[PDB]
Design a protein around this ligand. Structure first.
Ligand code: 2NC
Lengths: 99, 99
């Protein structure tokens, strides 16, 4: 669909078979989800944001549905202020910025 | 135009008489620009995201051209690692997310 930005671009996602709400984020390289139990092997890494760096668990090849669109890729799990869907998965669902 | 997300959606902007490169961030409520000596009155506020919060100066009615599109609104100035164009301005240039 076409989503305007007057409101935060929040969509429903399905991960680990669980429904969550996430923010479509063009300014995010990666996808970061709040702490949760996720079936899969992980590796600890650090990511950055506007205020500094935080440590997250890196899960690869995770099946996730975004607004009904399928994506299978890297999902970072950690203490993020909000669930965000980054470019790694936005490209998978064919999302583009238009103006 | 249409901007794909294979790489960071960076565009040229003009603010305070200077040209800079900024990130189109749909996951940002407001606009945060790198430290620059913008003239005029301002208000001290704090803004954040991943890693925490940072101190910035809030300027109102700032003229800013984004990728050739004129806009006018609130601009936060401070020690941000990246020039961030938020929704407050993305809506003004008619930007949408499409998939
Ligand atoms: C988590 C909060 C919501 C999403 C977030 C995404 N921001 C981009 C900004 C660009 C970097 C400064 C970001 O953090 N992107 C990260 C997301 C994490 C990730 N791993 O993708 C990123 O791409 N990080 C890269 C590196 C970015 C820096 N790059 C560089 N210096 N070359 C990384 N780690 O790979 N939004 C924000 O940070 C904005 N905050 C907000 O919109 C809200 N604040 C809060 C706390 O939620 C609102 C209430 O103010 C900031 C800019 C203030 C308006």
């Amino acid at each position: 669909p076409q989503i305007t930005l007057w409101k935060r671009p929040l969509v429903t996602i399905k991960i680990g078979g669980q429904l969550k709400e996430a923010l479509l984020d063009t300014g995010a390289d990666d996808t970061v989800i709040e702490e949760m139990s996720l079936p899969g092997r992980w590796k600890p890494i650090m990511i950055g944001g506007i205020g500094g760096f935080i440590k997250v668990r890196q899960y690869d090849q995770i099946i996730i549905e975004i607004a009904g669109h399928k994506a299978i890729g890297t999902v970072l799990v950690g203490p993020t202020p909000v669930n965000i869907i980054g470019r790694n998965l936005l490209t998978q669902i064919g999302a583009t910025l238009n103006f």
